[PDB]
Design a protein around this ligand. Structure first.
Ligand SMILES: COc1cc(Cc2cnc(N)nc2N)cc(/C=C/C(=O)N2N=Cc3ccccc3[C@@H]2c2ccccc2)c1OC
Ligand SMILES: [Ca+2]
Ligand SMILES: [Cl-]
Length: 166
């Protein structure tokens, strides 16, 4: 099972402002949709609510410690272990964010899908630091910038850098 972080952050790792995206890049979200199609999406409650709805064609799994938390059209999981069991037969799952949610899955991550937005926004929550010497880029592509997607941004994908033995 490939454990993948899915993330869009600015030049200071901002991933949110007052629980919402400080940017509006529909093309970027079209990319998330295309990339995650047919795979589970894993996200925290706060993250999930910051959207209002669930993405069709995707297994939405909400992670909260709240044992009474339910939402229609979604699954709820209360620990890392419960998510892995639930996703036991899946080839790839996408950790869809919450800083804390990313942190929960750090010891397990195999793949990084990182959108980097070339701008500094006002933010209050951040993509956790990561030592990238352990990682190797396998794909990059400049996003579509135009009237609907004002900012300049790049899709990046990283896999684990294999170490060559001494
Ligand atoms: C705080 O608000 C958000 C945060 C995140 C987290 C996130 C976004 N992008 C990337 N690359 N990584 C992330 N972890 C998503 C979202 C996603 C928003 C959102 O509305 N969508 N994001 C993806 C998606 C996937 C399947 C069905 C529908 C959607 C939907 C969408 C909207 C417009 C065009 C195409 C698809 C979000 O809401 C705006
Ligand atoms: Ca793995
Ligand atoms: Cl969250």
């Amino acid at each position: 099972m490939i454990v993948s972080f899915m993330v869009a952050m600015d030049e200071n790792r901002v991933i949110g402002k007052d629980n919402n995206l400080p940017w509006r890049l529909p093309s970027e979200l079209q990319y998330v949709k295309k990339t995650t199609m047919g795979h589970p999406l894993i996200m925290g409650r706060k993250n999930y609510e910051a959207i209002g709805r669930p993405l069709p064609g995707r297994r939405n799994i909400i992670v909260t410690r709240n044992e009474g938390y339910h939402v229609e059209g979604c699954e709820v999981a209360h620990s890392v272990e419960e998510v892995f069991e639930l996703c036991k037969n899946e080839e790839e799952i996408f950790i869809f964010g919450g800083a804390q949610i990313y942190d929960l899955f750090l010891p397990y991550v195999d793949k990084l899908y990182i959108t980097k937005i070339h701008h500094a926004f006002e933010g209050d929550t951040f993509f956790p630091e990561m030592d990238m010497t352990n990682w190797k880029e396998v794909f990059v592509e400049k996003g579509l910038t135009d009237e609907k997607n004002p900012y300049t941004y790049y899709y990046h994908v990283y896999e684990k850098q294999q170490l060559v033995p001494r």
